[PDB]
């Protein structure tokens, strides 16, 4: 269990059930569902097949002899085949009709679909909980007054609960596009054939296109979808998989956005990333950094996806059976690998006001010669050109101080024993007052919360309880 | 102009409109133009700007003096500064209150929206036209019978116009991303100032919420949008610009299979891509090999948007601004210019109904083995079993003969001369007739244009009748 | 074990060498055995540690309590810590000095240097051999003359091991980039401290400068390696993985080419894969699509550690060790898979040469025409615009007669009727003989086999004989 | 000139000869001049064409007639074919000698492998020259201590001249790669013919093998060549353009680590990239941003080669041919500019040594107190563990009082007033001089710099003149 190269994401990082999710043992279980469902469906469709047979097969559709399987599969070269006689062994009676009238994927395409869909559900309730829990921070920090970074350089004051509120919109949009997946995207492909023209099937209900049609359509019903594709080859259109890994890569580049700047803040002294207290304010950003690494790869997942379905050939070529084994169910381990550390992350992320009050501080006084200039022109009768460029030499002389000197901001002093700057040497002592400054950060977040956010993750105000618990 | 590097999208591949939607001068007349509906909202809000201003800028939008934007860019190190006063030296009335409140990104982001937004009203009806004249081809191809083929291997027979919607399937859904982007996607970035807390709006107007909110509500409406984004940081989210790029990207996988598809089927002869005639029937794929070669390109230009936007650091880093200079307009460019190949190799497809005739007859012997089985069993008392190996052993033999000594196909004068297979001899002589093989084929492609492409394209209707000439 | 989902790679296409190359016990096995060195090189440098200790740690350097690791890491959130202490409980001598004086990268990138450097040792024989087995068929079928293919499109006649040539020479050049990996590229990280500057074992040996080299001089030879870094951060430049996956996604680009091609050759019935007898004359290219999936999947492996090594911050950043968990290792084993299925592919790859022939007949007249007009010029006293003229008329027809009718080429019998080509009616018996156009086909195989393969493959011809087996 | 999309990469980033190296006259020039140096290897072969058909070709090789050309391709659609008329046009006497025996990949292939080893030509001078630029500031700066960072968080010191050799040994392996394809991986194509077997050739030369061998071997030499492919198909192996976009790739993640390390250090005041003065002391990193987003766009550059040459069919597929016209140039026209702009700031990086002073001082408590530790137990009879408890005790409240209340850091003087602690009490005055910490960083500089630097750019110290200058 220890001499053989473990997967990092099915023993490490991704949660138990989405591993559980992509499991041999669950696709076999769809394999042997779709094949009850199929007999289910022809016998009440007028072909004879006995419900004695139907429950043959429920009976023994979740003990699946594995060591059997392998060996079929070694002599036949074929795995959906390997599972067709060896659920045939365990089902003397119901054999001669299993797999009738289908090919290997009506259970290959058609379990791929229900385990793709089983897999946004289990992503979208993590998603709605990194929304919850970031918005209840936003909440609690909307007034939380901090330094705005662009370029990495001091830019005007923002509040911290604004800054989260623009992480929770690139969240609320892949929220919006996990679920028109689940709702919309993804369809059924039914029993379709070997090339999509139903001919078997036609072959089976001599020549009657209406049972044909009310298979597919009740299959579809019975596998929990709305609709099926209509015009397959032998597989969906794997465009589709496209879709699936362009919305998981979407994730990562929110994720790895999200935990980039809780790492910058980082070593600001800002904030810090919650962690095991098995020190507590001195430390790495380890789970911020990891959650970085696992969605850098996640967001690059996709790349594979493209090119693969660019060259399936006419109605099907196997060159993308391999890469699907590995790229959609990695996506899904790694997308939910993401989303449990970035719950984490934002349920026990901790602020530290002191220090952005003093980053504030030692940055305000160059934030506030403008507003200044203003001041001078508005109130002190003084030129513009003029007083700029008297501004601009209090200013380059202050700025020189701090990288040259290693010395502290003495902006405000020199405009105070300076005569030109009388007008403003009253406003002078409380110019550097952070809460006049930060617009509408407030209100903003108030609208954002109540507006977007609240009705965005309606339908999951019944799974936000769960926490989010990094073990590793 | 033969001197220097010419990228082949602007010059030999993409569409004269998509090429000066990114123009330079059209631009800075978005520029230009924000700066008057920013000065026109301002001043019906309440804020003294004369009409007189109003006018001066819009008598002189469409004049650029790039040479002094070049001059003032050059000095400045900034090129929305040096259009600031390069409009503000074209008008001087209306000078003092260009750009008034407002940050770079002011004009920068939404001109951007504004570009991006024409862009894809450029692609659409582009993607509808390539739709519309292969529902044509499927429509009049819906009972030209054809063999099907997996693993680049003959199956089961088909028809062209049935294959034909398999590719309309995947052009269906890239037209309703595509719609989706320009309808709900791409939002306005509107008035929201340095670091999106719109603070200095809020100055100008004495600190009245209401007036700051119309503001950004009214320049909404003025530039054709339907709703902004409420908590951006410096710039809108630009996980926007990965949602472009994947549907534009998704483009390229449906172009590069339809025309991949085109090329392997005129190895077999069976299909032909048009041509200038300026031989006729003796030449290579060279339109659908250079869609497939711009379609690869555009496939993966998808790759650099995601990283960027996965290290845009807190409220923004300019470390976006140069790439997207290059990779939003290339992808449309190359999209652009796969649309156009695509649509006039739709237009034109040549089919060969003989050679898909003889192709059909050389392969069916072999597809025809199954239902003669049942037929055996079904009509003369054969076990199943039995006649499996007798039939393998015949089939056998003649694929040797196919490959090893290059005979034709004489499966069917082998069981004609076995007694065994007495109950079919009747059948033999009209057992080929690929007619009643097809299942379903026609049918689907009735409905399937019917009910899902005439739908999709309905409001397109009167854009289908510009042709897609190739000069090149 | 079938209720996770396995990673195909480990289980169903790597070999078990790869397999076990990176698993965790071997990995714990190389930190120990780093350890030992460490604590070898620092006694016999003056440092006091009794070989009673050195011997206890080598007693017990396989054996490695797993279970107490992970009770560790839970409690330490620490992997290599974890494996400290682990080691130090199980080495009560020896606890004191274990680790002394170095970090965990000092176990951590020496032994994935050591893990990738065997990992290549891996790949080498492997690539040699699917060498060794594709220049055996080019000499076996240097004369064997058939179709080549532009656009795949028939062009001028070649040989089956003058094309297989074609792909030998690409897999020449991924033994060569291998092997430079591992000879010079791969360098040893060494004992560098936290931050490359060995301040840690400046202390330990009271800042004696030549110990400290000769203590990072004699790890290099210790284990294994030539040379180290000389001015790393904490880690070995990560540039280096950059190389690796690049070299190694190369091999996939290669892979997939020549199984694309054994694809499209297949279905011209002029070649097919090897496959188990456990039908023989007819099946699809089942093993090649599988190479092509796991190439593409290989070919992509490396656009996500490009982008982790840019972001990479200063001395070091953690979120580049879980994504290196993932692609490192599995890059390895893609490209394990694709060397094994390529080298079965290429022992027993069959081909068929009637086909070939038949081809190679049905394409000749039209290939024929051109030295047709030579033979006029030179022969027959024939203008050139004039000849050329009317031998297009005569294919433009054939060529009609061909796609338009599904009749056979008759181009040779329409100039043998025609009196203008009286001056070729002589050489027409003959002017279809495939042996005279194919050039220098069969000399340029002797001589690259000799020349450029024999000497590649050098140093490997006692690694050749093993076959390659695909059981599933 | 502004109302077509201009691609910044040839208006505003790359140099002006790199943007001329792929021009469409440069090619042309490179058409002709190939040729040429086919008739005059021809004519010296024992072939019949007059020096004064040479001489023609000569005379006008420089004055190509794009007017000509542009018509005869709209008319022949095909771009060589045009220019060979166009040549034989403006050449009368030489018309039917042009392009003997060739095919169009002849002039095609043979002129891109010129026009890519003048494009590693201009490469290889700017990636010495940021060698050089860095290895003077590295130099300079050997002493400069300052703070390293790990996970972006405060570590042990070292100096800026021993951070800036990690930049330049990434650069030294960007060198090794470029000069390894310039002078090995690139070969020539040659004259192959149409599938490489010289059938041609050989006809023209009656069979004559050792003629055909010296047409390609003096042709290798005429255009500046070593040796040439032997067994291409019709092209080169595409392969090599895969090796080309690697390399250069690589160089985008080098320049993007050198720039976000430099982005970031600018955040915490220590450096700061050099500017046009046309404030000084108070900017933004707008050039290393640049370098960034170019870097990032030339990273991802090669995805797309690696998926076109996997998909190269049999002999030759023409669906390389227009994103070769697009990838290849745009990956050295990125290059090219991210060179230059990285040995822009690498020459006016400006460092600021007090405040790499005043922030390596508030985070020395903190980096000593493992050796305090070390000298409790060595020098005051002190226990490890009771030692190591309570120096975390006084650590953890301490780094309280950093985060929680904005204090500065009081660790020294807890420790001072503890009477445990009176064994280091007089060390406690000078324990925070940073000179002794530094371990070997100083003497890796001059090694580093004298062994490895300084014979890698050996070649090049004619050509470290130039200054890079950035106008925009
Ligand atoms: N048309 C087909 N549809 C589904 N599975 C197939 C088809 N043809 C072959 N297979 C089987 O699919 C498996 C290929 O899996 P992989 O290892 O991913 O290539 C093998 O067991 C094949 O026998
Ligand atoms: N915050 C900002 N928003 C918009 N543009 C900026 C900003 N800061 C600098 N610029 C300008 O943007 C341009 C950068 O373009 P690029 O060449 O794509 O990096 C330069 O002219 C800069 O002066
Ligand atoms: N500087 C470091 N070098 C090596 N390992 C570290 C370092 N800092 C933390 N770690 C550990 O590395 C592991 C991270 O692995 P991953 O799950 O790939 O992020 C955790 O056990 C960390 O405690
Ligand atoms: N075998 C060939 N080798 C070189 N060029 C060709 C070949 N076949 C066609 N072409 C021409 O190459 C050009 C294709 O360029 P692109 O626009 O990049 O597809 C057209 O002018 C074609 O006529």
């Given at each position: 269990?220890?001499?053989?190269?473990?997967?990092?994401?099915?023993?490490?990082?991704?949660?138990?059930?989405?591993?559980?999710?992509?499991?041999?043992?669950?696709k076999?279980?769809?394999?042997?569902?779709?094949?009850?469902?199929?007999?289910?469906?022809?016998?009440?469709?007028?072909?004879?097949?006995?419900?004695?047979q139907?429950?043959?097969?429920?009976?023994?559709?979740?003990?699946?002899?594995?060591?059997?399987?392998?060996?079929?599969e070694?002599?036949?070269?074929?795995?959906?085949?390997?599972?067709?006689?060896?659920?045939?062994?365990?089902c003397?009676?119901?054999?001669?009709?299993?797999?009738?009238?289908?090919?290997?994927?009506?259970?290959?395409?058609?379990?791929?679909?229900?385990?793709?869909?089983?897999g946004?559900?289990?992503?979208?309730?993590?998603?709605?909980?990194?929304?919850?829990?970031l918005?209840?921070?936003?909440?609690?920090?909307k007034?939380?007054?901090?330094?705005?970074?662009?370029?990495?350089?001091?830019?005007?004051?923002?509040?911290?609960?604004?800054?989260i509120?623009?992480?929770?919109?690139?969240?609320?949009?892949?929220?919006?596009?996990?679920?028109?997946?689940?709702?919309?995207?993804?369809?059924?492909?039914?029993?379709?054939?070997?090339?999509?023209?139903?001919?078997?099937?036609?072959?089976?209900?001599?020549?009657?296109?209406?049972?044909?049609?009310?298979?597919?359509?009740?299959?579809?019903?019975?596998?929990?979808?709305?609709?099926?594709?209509?015009?397959?080859?032998?597989?969906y259109?794997?465009?589709?998989?496209?879709?699936?890994?362009?919305?998981?890569?979407?994730?990562?580049?929110?994720?790895?956005?999200?935990?980039?700047?809780?790492?910058?803040?980082?070593?600001?002294?800002?904030?810090?990333?919650?962690?095991?207290?098995?020190?507590?304010?001195?430390?790495?950003?380890?789970?911020?950094?990891?959650?970085?690494?696992?969605?850098?790869?996640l967001?690059?997942?996709?790349?594979?996806?493209?090119?693969?379905v660019?060259?399936?050939?006419?109605?099907?070529?196997?060159?993308?059976?391999?890469?699907?084994?590995?790229?959609?169910?990695?996506?899904?381990?790694?997308?939910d690998?993401?989303?449990?550390?970035?719950?984490?992350?934002?349920?026990?992320?901790?602020?530290?006001?002191?220090?952005?009050?003093?980053?504030?501080?030692?940055?305000?006084?160059?934030?506030?010669?403008?507003?200044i200039?203003?001041?001078?022109?508005?109130?002190?009768?003084?030129?513009?050109?003029?007083?700029?460029?008297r501004?601009?030499?209090?200013?380059?002389?202050?700025?020189?101080?701090?990288?040259?000197?290693?010395?502290?901001?003495?902006?405000?002093?020199?405009?105070?024993?300076?005569?030109?700057?009388?007008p403003?040497?009253?406003?002078?002592?409380?110019?550097?007052?952070?809460?006049?400054?930060?617009?509408?950060?407030?209100?903003?977040?108030?609208?954002?919360?109540?507006?977007?956010?609240?009705?965005?993750?309606?339908?999951?105000?019944?799974?936000?309880?769960?926490?989010?618990?990094?073990?590793?």
């Amino acid at each position: 269990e220890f001499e053989e190269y473990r997967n990092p994401l099915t023993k490490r990082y991704a949660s138990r059930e989405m591993v559980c999710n992509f499991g041999e043992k669950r696709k076999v279980i769809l394999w042997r569902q779709l094949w009850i469902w199929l007999a289910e469906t022809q016998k009440e469709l007028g072909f004879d097949i006995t419900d004695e047979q139907i429950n043959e097969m429920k009976s023994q559709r979740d003990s699946v002899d594995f060591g059997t399987a392998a060996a079929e599969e070694k002599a036949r070269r074929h795995d959906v085949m390997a599972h067709v006689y060896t659920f045939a062994l365990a089902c003397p009676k119901a054999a001669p009709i299993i797999h009738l009238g289908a090919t290997s994927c009506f259970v290959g395409d058609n379990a791929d679909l229900i385990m793709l869909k089983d897999g946004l559900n289990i992503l979208l309730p993590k998603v709605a909980r990194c929304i919850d829990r970031l918005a209840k921070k936003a909440m609690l920090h909307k007034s939380l007054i901090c330094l705005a970074r662009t370029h990495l350089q001091p830019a005007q004051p923002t509040t911290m609960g604004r800054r989260i509120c623009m992480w929770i919109q690139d969240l609320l949009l892949d929220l919006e596009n996990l679920e028109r997946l689940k709702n919309h995207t993804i369809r059924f492909r039914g029993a379709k054939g070997a090339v999509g023209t139903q001919a078997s099937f036609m072959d089976l209900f001599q020549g009657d296109h209406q049972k044909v049609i009310k298979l597919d359509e009740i299959l579809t019903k019975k596998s929990g979808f709305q609709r099926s594709w209509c015009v397959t080859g032998q597989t969906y259109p794997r465009k589709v998989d496209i879709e699936i890994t362009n919305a998981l890569s979407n994730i990562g580049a929110t994720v790895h956005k999200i935990c980039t700047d809780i790492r910058l803040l980082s070593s600001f002294h800002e904030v810090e990333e919650p962690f095991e207290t098995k020190m507590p304010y001195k430390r790495n950003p380890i789970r911020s950094e990891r959650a970085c690494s696992l969605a850098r790869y996640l967001m690059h997942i996709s790349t594979s996806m493209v090119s693969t379905v660019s060259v399936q050939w006419l109605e099907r070529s196997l060159d993308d059976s391999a890469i699907r084994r590995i790229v959609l169910p990695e996506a899904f381990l790694a997308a939910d690998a993401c989303l449990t550390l970035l719950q984490n992350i934002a349920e026990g992320l901790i602020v530290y006001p002191m220090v952005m009050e003093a980053n504030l501080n030692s940055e305000l006084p160059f934030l506030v010669v403008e507003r200044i200039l203003v001041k001078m022109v508005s109130e002190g009768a003084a030129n513009r050109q003029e007083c700029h460029e008297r501004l601009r030499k209090h200013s380059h002389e202050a700025a020189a101080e701090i990288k040259l000197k290693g010395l502290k901001n003495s902006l405000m002093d020199k405009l105070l024993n300076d005569y030109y700057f009388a007008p403003i040497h009253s406003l002078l002592p409380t110019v550097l007052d952070p809460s006049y400054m930060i617009g509408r950060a407030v209100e903003q977040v108030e609208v954002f919360l109540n507006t977007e956010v609240d009705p965005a993750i309606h339908s999951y105000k019944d799974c936000l309880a769960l926490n989010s618990n990094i073990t590793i």
